[PDB]
GROMACS .gro file of C-alpha atoms in nm:
model
  401
    1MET     CA    1  -0.519  -1.298  -2.088
    2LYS     CA    2  -0.538  -0.994  -1.859
    3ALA     CA    3  -0.538  -1.033  -1.481
    4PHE     CA    4  -0.685  -0.789  -1.227
    5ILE     CA    5  -0.592  -0.816  -0.860
    6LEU     CA    6  -0.849  -0.642  -0.641
    7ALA     CA    7  -0.641  -0.493  -0.357
    8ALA     CA    8  -0.852  -0.186  -0.270
    9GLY     CA    9  -0.981  -0.243   0.091
   10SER     CA   10  -0.959  -0.178   0.398
   11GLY     CA   11  -0.746  -0.285   0.550
   12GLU     CA   12  -0.953  -0.271   0.864
   13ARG     CA   13  -0.993  -0.632   0.959
   14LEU     CA   14  -0.615  -0.675   0.941
   15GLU     CA   15  -0.522  -0.387   1.173
   16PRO     CA   16  -0.277  -0.312   1.323
   17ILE     CA   17  -0.066  -0.478   1.053
   18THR     CA   18  -0.243  -0.254   0.795
   19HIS     CA   19  -0.164   0.068   0.972
   20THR     CA   20   0.162   0.084   0.783
   21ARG     CA   21   0.128  -0.146   0.474
   22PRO     CA   22  -0.165  -0.251   0.242
   23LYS     CA   23  -0.278  -0.607   0.308
   24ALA     CA   24  -0.135  -0.714  -0.030
   25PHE     CA   25   0.206  -0.669   0.131
   26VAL     CA   26   0.153  -0.893   0.438
   27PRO     CA   27   0.456  -1.127   0.437
   28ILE     CA   28   0.433  -1.500   0.404
   29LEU     CA   29   0.781  -1.610   0.503
   30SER     CA   30   1.007  -1.370   0.321
   31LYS     CA   31   0.775  -1.221   0.056
   32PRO     CA   32   0.453  -1.027   0.041
   33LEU     CA   33   0.123  -1.196  -0.044
   34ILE     CA   34   0.087  -1.004  -0.372
   35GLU     CA   35   0.420  -1.137  -0.491
   36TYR     CA   36   0.285  -1.493  -0.469
   37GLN     CA   37  -0.028  -1.393  -0.664
   38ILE     CA   38   0.176  -1.224  -0.938
   39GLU     CA   39   0.409  -1.520  -0.955
   40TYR     CA   40   0.120  -1.775  -0.985
   41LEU     CA   41  -0.027  -1.553  -1.261
   42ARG     CA   42   0.304  -1.548  -1.450
   43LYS     CA   43   0.345  -1.921  -1.408
   44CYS     CA   44   0.011  -1.945  -1.597
   45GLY     CA   45   0.138  -1.722  -1.878
   46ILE     CA   46  -0.040  -1.409  -1.758
   47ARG     CA   47   0.183  -1.101  -1.777
   48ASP     CA   48  -0.057  -0.818  -1.819
   49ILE     CA   49  -0.137  -0.773  -1.453
   50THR     CA   50  -0.320  -0.478  -1.308
   51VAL     CA   51  -0.380  -0.400  -0.940
   52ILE     CA   52  -0.687  -0.198  -0.844
   53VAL     CA   53  -0.589  -0.009  -0.530
   54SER     CA   54  -0.711   0.285  -0.324
   55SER     CA   55  -0.570   0.636  -0.395
   56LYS     CA   56  -0.423   0.637  -0.042
   57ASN     CA   57  -0.226   0.324  -0.142
   58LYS     CA   58  -0.135   0.415  -0.505
   59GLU     CA   59   0.216   0.540  -0.421
   60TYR     CA   60   0.314   0.239  -0.211
   61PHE     CA   61   0.227  -0.014  -0.485
   62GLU     CA   62   0.403   0.183  -0.756
   63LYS     CA   63   0.715   0.200  -0.540
   64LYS     CA   64   0.724  -0.175  -0.458
   65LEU     CA   65   0.594  -0.353  -0.771
   66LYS     CA   66   0.835  -0.347  -1.068
   67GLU     CA   67   0.645  -0.423  -1.392
   68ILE     CA   68   0.279  -0.415  -1.290
   69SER     CA   69   0.002  -0.171  -1.371
   70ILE     CA   70  -0.155   0.012  -1.084
   71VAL     CA   71  -0.498   0.158  -1.114
   72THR     CA   72  -0.673   0.346  -0.837
   73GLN     CA   73  -1.033   0.268  -0.760
   74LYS     CA   74  -1.339   0.492  -0.805
   75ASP     CA   75  -1.356   0.709  -0.493
   76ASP     CA   76  -1.723   0.805  -0.515
   77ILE     CA   77  -1.788   0.427  -0.448
   78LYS     CA   78  -1.673   0.111  -0.255
   79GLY     CA   79  -1.691  -0.271  -0.311
   80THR     CA   80  -1.557  -0.563  -0.514
   81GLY     CA   81  -1.760  -0.450  -0.816
   82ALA     CA   82  -1.685  -0.078  -0.772
   83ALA     CA   83  -1.321  -0.190  -0.807
   84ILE     CA   84  -1.385  -0.317  -1.160
   85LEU     CA   85  -1.583  -0.002  -1.235
   86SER     CA   86  -1.214   0.071  -1.288
   87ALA     CA   87  -1.172  -0.240  -1.512
   88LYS     CA   88  -1.012  -0.161  -1.850
   89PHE     CA   89  -1.086  -0.484  -2.044
   90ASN     CA   90  -1.263  -0.629  -2.346
   91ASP     CA   91  -1.295  -1.006  -2.426
   92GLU     CA   92  -1.173  -1.175  -2.106
   93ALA     CA   93  -1.003  -1.108  -1.773
   94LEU     CA   94  -0.883  -1.313  -1.479
   95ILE     CA   95  -0.998  -1.139  -1.157
   96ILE     CA   96  -0.851  -1.232  -0.819
   97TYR     CA   97  -0.903  -1.087  -0.471
   98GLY     CA   98  -0.600  -0.932  -0.316
   99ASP     CA   99  -0.618  -1.118   0.016
  100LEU     CA  100  -0.637  -1.479  -0.092
  101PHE     CA  101  -0.352  -1.715  -0.057
  102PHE     CA  102  -0.366  -2.027  -0.273
  103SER     CA  103  -0.105  -2.299  -0.291
  104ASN     CA  104  -0.128  -2.372  -0.659
  105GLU     CA  105  -0.194  -2.196  -0.986
  106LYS     CA  106  -0.305  -2.521  -1.158
  107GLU     CA  107  -0.663  -2.402  -1.139
  108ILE     CA  108  -0.588  -2.063  -1.288
  109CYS     CA  109  -0.393  -2.207  -1.580
  110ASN     CA  110  -0.693  -2.422  -1.637
  111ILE     CA  111  -0.965  -2.152  -1.613
  112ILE     CA  112  -0.799  -1.916  -1.866
  113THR     CA  113  -0.826  -2.176  -2.142
  114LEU     CA  114  -1.211  -2.155  -2.123
  115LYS     CA  115  -1.428  -1.950  -2.357
  116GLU     CA  116  -1.710  -1.934  -2.107
  117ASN     CA  117  -1.733  -1.736  -1.786
  118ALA     CA  118  -1.595  -1.955  -1.505
  119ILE     CA  119  -1.547  -1.939  -1.127
  120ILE     CA  120  -1.337  -2.130  -0.873
  121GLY     CA  121  -1.501  -2.289  -0.570
  122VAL     CA  122  -1.330  -2.435  -0.270
  123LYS     CA  123  -1.465  -2.663   0.002
  124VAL     CA  124  -1.446  -2.503   0.351
  125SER     CA  125  -1.559  -2.675   0.673
  126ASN     CA  126  -1.743  -2.357   0.783
  127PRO     CA  127  -1.940  -2.242   0.477
  128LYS     CA  128  -2.166  -1.987   0.660
  129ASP     CA  129  -1.958  -1.758   0.588
  130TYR     CA  130  -1.853  -1.700   0.284
  131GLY     CA  131  -2.088  -1.701  -0.016
  132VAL     CA  132  -2.205  -2.059  -0.069
  133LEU     CA  133  -2.224  -2.192  -0.427
  134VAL     CA  134  -2.560  -2.331  -0.548
  135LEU     CA  135  -2.481  -2.574  -0.829
  136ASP     CA  136  -2.759  -2.647  -1.086
  137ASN     CA  137  -2.842  -3.002  -1.212
  138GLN     CA  138  -2.542  -2.991  -1.449
  139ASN     CA  139  -2.293  -2.835  -1.206
  140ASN     CA  140  -2.244  -2.491  -1.355
  141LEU     CA  141  -2.353  -2.201  -1.134
  142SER     CA  142  -2.713  -2.160  -1.024
  143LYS     CA  143  -2.658  -1.888  -0.762
  144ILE     CA  144  -2.432  -1.767  -0.476
  145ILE     CA  145  -2.600  -1.707  -0.138
  146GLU     CA  146  -2.423  -1.425   0.042
  147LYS     CA  147  -2.344  -1.534   0.400
  148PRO     CA  148  -2.682  -1.703   0.476
  149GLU     CA  149  -2.616  -1.841   0.833
  150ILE     CA  150  -2.747  -2.170   0.692
  151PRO     CA  151  -2.495  -2.374   0.486
  152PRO     CA  152  -2.670  -2.522   0.173
  153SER     CA  153  -2.322  -2.641   0.049
  154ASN     CA  154  -1.955  -2.685   0.145
  155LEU     CA  155  -1.861  -2.519  -0.186
  156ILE     CA  156  -1.782  -2.152  -0.134
  157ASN     CA  157  -1.678  -1.873  -0.372
  158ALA     CA  158  -1.294  -1.901  -0.381
  159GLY     CA  159  -1.274  -1.544  -0.530
  160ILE     CA  160  -1.088  -1.643  -0.853
  161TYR     CA  161  -1.287  -1.540  -1.162
  162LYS     CA  162  -1.242  -1.568  -1.537
  163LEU     CA  163  -1.503  -1.330  -1.675
  164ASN     CA  164  -1.587  -1.206  -2.023
  165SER     CA  165  -1.685  -0.847  -2.108
  166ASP     CA  166  -2.055  -0.951  -2.058
  167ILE     CA  167  -1.993  -0.886  -1.691
  168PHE     CA  168  -2.021  -0.506  -1.744
  169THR     CA  169  -2.379  -0.536  -1.866
  170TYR     CA  170  -2.506  -0.693  -1.540
  171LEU     CA  171  -2.287  -0.459  -1.333
  172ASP     CA  172  -2.505  -0.166  -1.440
  173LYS     CA  173  -2.830  -0.363  -1.420
  174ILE     CA  174  -2.732  -0.455  -1.061
  175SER     CA  175  -2.863  -0.210  -0.798
  176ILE     CA  176  -2.626  -0.191  -0.504
  177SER     CA  177  -2.638  -0.248  -0.217
  178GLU     CA  178  -2.747  -0.350   0.134
  179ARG     CA  179  -2.397  -0.283   0.281
  180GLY     CA  180  -2.325   0.013   0.046
  181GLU     CA  181  -2.088  -0.216  -0.145
  182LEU     CA  182  -2.134  -0.249  -0.521
  183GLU     CA  183  -2.066  -0.622  -0.523
  184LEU     CA  184  -1.941  -0.853  -0.792
  185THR     CA  185  -2.137  -1.165  -0.694
  186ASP     CA  186  -2.470  -0.980  -0.755
  187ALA     CA  187  -2.381  -0.921  -1.120
  188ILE     CA  188  -2.249  -1.278  -1.157
  189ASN     CA  189  -2.586  -1.400  -1.027
  190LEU     CA  190  -2.800  -1.242  -1.300
  191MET     CA  191  -2.546  -1.348  -1.564
  192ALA     CA  192  -2.560  -1.708  -1.435
  193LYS     CA  193  -2.929  -1.710  -1.537
  194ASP     CA  194  -2.864  -1.616  -1.902
  195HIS     CA  195  -2.503  -1.731  -1.931
  196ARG     CA  196  -2.345  -2.060  -1.840
  197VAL     CA  197  -2.088  -1.989  -1.566
  198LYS     CA  198  -1.865  -2.299  -1.510
  199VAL     CA  199  -1.751  -2.393  -1.163
  200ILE     CA  200  -1.406  -2.549  -1.115
  201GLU     CA  201  -1.345  -2.697  -0.772
  202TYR     CA  202  -1.019  -2.579  -0.617
  203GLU     CA  203  -0.816  -2.872  -0.485
  204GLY     CA  204  -0.505  -2.763  -0.278
  205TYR     CA  205  -0.474  -2.492  -0.005
  206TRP     CA  206  -0.685  -2.174   0.007
  207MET     CA  207  -0.710  -1.909   0.285
  208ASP     CA  208  -0.851  -1.561   0.274
  209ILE     CA  209  -0.631  -1.358   0.498
  210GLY     CA  210  -0.926  -1.186   0.658
  211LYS     CA  211  -0.834  -1.177   1.027
  212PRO     CA  212  -0.497  -1.109   1.195
  213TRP     CA  213  -0.448  -1.460   1.319
  214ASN     CA  214  -0.471  -1.585   0.957
  215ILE     CA  215  -0.128  -1.434   0.906
  216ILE     CA  216  -0.015  -1.711   1.144
  217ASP     CA  217  -0.229  -1.966   0.957
  218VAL     CA  218  -0.070  -1.902   0.611
  219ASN     CA  219   0.284  -1.856   0.733
  220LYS     CA  220   0.256  -2.187   0.915
  221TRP     CA  221   0.130  -2.356   0.600
  222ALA     CA  222   0.406  -2.202   0.391
  223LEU     CA  223   0.678  -2.303   0.638
  224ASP     CA  224   0.552  -2.657   0.618
  225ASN     CA  225   0.501  -2.676   0.245
  226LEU     CA  226   0.695  -2.426   0.041
  227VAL     CA  227   1.050  -2.445   0.189
  228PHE     CA  228   1.307  -2.702   0.299
  229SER     CA  229   1.580  -2.726   0.566
  230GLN     CA  230   1.883  -2.518   0.465
  231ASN     CA  231   2.167  -2.318   0.609
  232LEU     CA  232   2.305  -2.020   0.411
  233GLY     CA  233   2.412  -1.830   0.724
  234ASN     CA  234   2.670  -1.851   1.003
  235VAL     CA  235   2.607  -2.081   1.300
  236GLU     CA  236   2.853  -2.078   1.588
  237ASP     CA  237   2.941  -2.372   1.803
  238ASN     CA  238   2.693  -2.490   2.066
  239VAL     CA  239   2.379  -2.419   1.877
  240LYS     CA  240   2.136  -2.711   1.890
  241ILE     CA  241   1.911  -2.766   1.589
  242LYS     CA  242   1.618  -3.007   1.559
  243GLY     CA  243   1.374  -3.050   1.268
  244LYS     CA  244   1.324  -2.818   0.971
  245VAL     CA  245   1.520  -2.496   0.989
  246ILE     CA  246   1.563  -2.235   0.716
  247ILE     CA  247   1.864  -2.018   0.782
  248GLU     CA  248   1.904  -1.746   0.522
  249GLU     CA  249   2.207  -1.564   0.404
  250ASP     CA  250   2.378  -1.320   0.633
  251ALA     CA  251   2.199  -1.470   0.935
  252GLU     CA  252   2.418  -1.525   1.242
  253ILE     CA  253   2.337  -1.775   1.516
  254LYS     CA  254   2.533  -1.755   1.841
  255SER     CA  255   2.620  -2.023   2.087
  256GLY     CA  256   2.369  -2.144   2.344
  257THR     CA  257   2.089  -2.102   2.094
  258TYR     CA  258   1.836  -2.389   2.079
  259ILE     CA  259   1.606  -2.435   1.779
  260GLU     CA  260   1.318  -2.681   1.764
  261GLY     CA  261   1.201  -2.669   1.400
  262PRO     CA  262   1.008  -2.585   1.191
  263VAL     CA  263   1.163  -2.241   1.203
  264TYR     CA  264   1.225  -1.981   0.939
  265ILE     CA  265   1.518  -1.743   1.002
  266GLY     CA  266   1.507  -1.446   0.760
  267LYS     CA  267   1.818  -1.292   0.604
  268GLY     CA  268   2.044  -1.071   0.806
  269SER     CA  269   1.899  -1.205   1.132
  270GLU     CA  270   2.105  -1.207   1.450
  271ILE     CA  271   1.996  -1.475   1.698
  272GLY     CA  272   2.148  -1.542   2.035
  273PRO     CA  273   2.336  -1.607   2.245
  274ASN     CA  274   2.117  -1.835   2.455
  275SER     CA  275   1.801  -1.786   2.252
  276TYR     CA  276   1.527  -2.049   2.222
  277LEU     CA  277   1.332  -2.072   1.893
  278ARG     CA  278   1.035  -2.306   1.909
  279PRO     CA  279   0.817  -2.457   1.635
  280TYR     CA  280   0.662  -2.211   1.388
  281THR     CA  281   0.896  -1.926   1.464
  282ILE     CA  282   0.905  -1.714   1.150
  283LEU     CA  283   1.145  -1.425   1.145
  284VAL     CA  284   1.084  -1.257   0.811
  285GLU     CA  285   1.401  -1.052   0.765
  286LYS     CA  286   1.674  -0.883   0.967
  287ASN     CA  287   1.540  -0.968   1.310
  288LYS     CA  288   1.719  -0.956   1.639
  289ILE     CA  289   1.633  -1.229   1.894
  290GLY     CA  290   1.866  -1.191   2.203
  291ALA     CA  291   1.970  -1.373   2.518
  292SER     CA  292   1.691  -1.526   2.720
  293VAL     CA  293   1.436  -1.459   2.450
  294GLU     CA  294   1.193  -1.736   2.358
  295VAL     CA  295   0.957  -1.729   2.055
  296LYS     CA  296   0.691  -1.977   1.953
  297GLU     CA  297   0.442  -1.979   1.670
  298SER     CA  298   0.473  -1.617   1.570
  299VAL     CA  299   0.548  -1.403   1.273
  300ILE     CA  300   0.789  -1.122   1.342
  301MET     CA  301   0.830  -0.890   1.045
  302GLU     CA  302   1.119  -0.697   0.892
  303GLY     CA  303   1.392  -0.555   1.116
  304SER     CA  304   1.191  -0.610   1.439
  305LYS     CA  305   1.396  -0.660   1.748
  306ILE     CA  306   1.327  -0.869   2.064
  307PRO     CA  307   1.664  -0.847   2.233
  308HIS     CA  308   1.628  -0.939   2.607
  309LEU     CA  309   1.426  -1.140   2.858
  310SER     CA  310   1.120  -1.188   2.649
  311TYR     CA  311   0.867  -1.453   2.558
  312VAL     CA  312   0.665  -1.413   2.228
  313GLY     CA  313   0.411  -1.691   2.178
  314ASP     CA  314   0.133  -1.709   1.915
  315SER     CA  315   0.171  -1.353   1.802
  316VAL     CA  316   0.208  -1.136   1.496
  317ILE     CA  317   0.458  -0.855   1.526
  318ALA     CA  318   0.489  -0.604   1.250
  319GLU     CA  319   0.794  -0.417   1.114
  320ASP     CA  320   1.055  -0.219   1.304
  321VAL     CA  321   0.916  -0.308   1.649
  322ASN     CA  322   1.148  -0.301   1.949
  323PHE     CA  323   1.079  -0.486   2.269
  324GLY     CA  324   1.208  -0.345   2.583
  325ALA     CA  325   1.379  -0.590   2.824
  326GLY     CA  326   1.122  -0.791   2.994
  327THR     CA  327   0.810  -0.737   2.774
  328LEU     CA  328   0.605  -1.061   2.791
  329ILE     CA  329   0.302  -1.149   2.589
  330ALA     CA  330   0.039  -1.366   2.745
  331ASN     CA  331  -0.119  -1.625   2.512
  332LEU     CA  332  -0.376  -1.785   2.746
  333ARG     CA  333  -0.676  -1.638   2.943
  334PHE     CA  334  -0.697  -1.715   3.319
  335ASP     CA  335  -0.999  -1.925   3.218
  336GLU     CA  336  -0.843  -2.101   2.916
  337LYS     CA  337  -1.132  -2.058   2.665
  338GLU     CA  338  -1.112  -1.902   2.311
  339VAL     CA  339  -0.935  -1.573   2.287
  340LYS     CA  340  -1.154  -1.288   2.157
  341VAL     CA  341  -1.021  -1.003   1.938
  342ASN     CA  342  -1.187  -0.676   1.843
  343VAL     CA  343  -1.210  -0.676   1.467
  344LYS     CA  344  -1.375  -0.366   1.308
  345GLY     CA  345  -1.547  -0.282   1.636
  346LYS     CA  346  -1.679  -0.634   1.708
  347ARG     CA  347  -1.549  -0.880   1.974
  348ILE     CA  348  -1.497  -1.198   1.784
  349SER     CA  349  -1.348  -1.529   1.871
  350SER     CA  350  -1.031  -1.627   1.711
  351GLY     CA  351  -1.105  -1.995   1.745
  352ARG     CA  352  -0.777  -2.023   1.933
  353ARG     CA  353  -0.730  -2.124   2.293
  354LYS     CA  354  -0.372  -1.987   2.263
  355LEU     CA  355  -0.340  -1.645   2.104
  356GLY     CA  356  -0.109  -1.362   2.202
  357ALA     CA  357  -0.088  -1.021   2.056
  358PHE     CA  358  -0.106  -0.816   1.733
  359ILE     CA  359   0.163  -0.544   1.725
  360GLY     CA  360   0.177  -0.261   1.467
  361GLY     CA  361   0.488  -0.139   1.293
  362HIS     CA  362   0.736   0.084   1.473
  363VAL     CA  363   0.606   0.005   1.815
  364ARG     CA  364   0.847   0.041   2.111
  365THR     CA  365   0.752  -0.117   2.443
  366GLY     CA  366   0.921  -0.008   2.764
  367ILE     CA  367   1.100  -0.265   2.991
  368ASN     CA  368   0.886  -0.513   3.181
  369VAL     CA  369   0.582  -0.447   2.976
  370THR     CA  370   0.293  -0.701   3.019
  371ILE     CA  371   0.056  -0.756   2.715
  372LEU     CA  372  -0.273  -0.951   2.761
  373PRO     CA  373  -0.401  -1.219   2.518
  374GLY     CA  374  -0.554  -1.102   2.185
  375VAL     CA  375  -0.464  -0.735   2.237
  376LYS     CA  376  -0.390  -0.515   1.936
  377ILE     CA  377  -0.132  -0.246   1.952
  378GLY     CA  378  -0.145   0.023   1.681
  379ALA     CA  379   0.158   0.116   1.473
  380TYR     CA  380   0.385   0.384   1.633
  381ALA     CA  381   0.239   0.318   1.980
  382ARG     CA  382   0.452   0.378   2.291
  383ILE     CA  383   0.402   0.165   2.601
  384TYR     CA  384   0.532   0.301   2.928
  385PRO     CA  385   0.781   0.082   3.118
  386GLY     CA  386   0.604  -0.169   3.344
  387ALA     CA  387   0.253  -0.099   3.197
  388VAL     CA  388  -0.007  -0.378   3.170
  389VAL     CA  389  -0.171  -0.354   2.831
  390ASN     CA  390  -0.517  -0.488   2.906
  391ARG     CA  391  -0.696  -0.325   2.612
  392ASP     CA  392  -0.641  -0.226   2.246
  393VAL     CA  393  -0.396   0.059   2.200
  394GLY     CA  394  -0.461   0.310   1.916
  395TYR     CA  395  -0.240   0.404   1.624
  396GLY     CA  396   0.025   0.639   1.748
  397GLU     CA  397  -0.079   0.628   2.119
  398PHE     CA  398   0.123   0.649   2.432
  399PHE     CA  399  -0.013   0.399   2.683
  400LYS     CA  400   0.063   0.398   3.063
  401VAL     CA  401  -0.272   0.278   3.211
   0.00000   0.00000   0.00000
């Protein structure tokens, strides 16, 4: 079987994390998303894996992914289906979207054994949304309604396909489109009329990582489900530990530190003294968390440093960020309703009453910096000492007021 991972976005909805890395490389605990996909694939016996990427991102993938084929997408076009206008297959291919996280490959191993075109569907409690799956009288695919604001079903398109070379036929016959995007689903919808397209229902955990808070979502899931309490590091005397705690090799934990698990402490981390790690603290790798620093429910990526007099709650902080002494993120509005976030130029609700900030790679905040809830700070941004960040900060911007 051949597998194609469609990793060619944009990007945009996951800013500022995507200012410095393609979404396929968003970490879930210690490893990038795409590394889980590839590893699920290989557990199913699929080895011939190709990533369709953008030309911008071609170099990055090649550099990071050892034995995987990288193929840049058609530039004269954009979409899910314009991606596989770069598909190099006959017979059959497994197609997956580059931003999905799924807990188990059991469905993939199952789909590849089928001669017919098949598709995975998952039940979400918000099917709007999401292309909803219309199942005919026999439970193969009738059609997929693209984001209809009425939910005809709880079954949505899980974005895991096993398609035969017949797909190319309907890809040409499909005129595209009303967003500009040459879409896959369109082509699958004509084919579903002639061809029988099975529908397997996905059973475990699925998440498309389509908004920055979903990085918290999957990392929380993973902390709960994929790892178990262990200590491969150095813990000094007078550190209190409760609950599940992953301490990785080379990690050093200094006295006075207090950990209420579940907490993931990435390798090479230096915690303490007198730090407080609270449930769902995920330090991906080589992080510094100093004296009088408290973290709760956040993902702090590689080599990022929060060394003094800081609270980080419900946030996502990207790689090589440094907090000046006294930066504080707020995670609650004065009026305690859902925190809104600008995502591709729209103010949308996160669904979260508590939500702090989204910080790009290589950010440096001055001392005593104040960040409001749901604010995004662009990679490479510089925040003047004492400033109150009460709006989104651009990529590479200095911010004072």
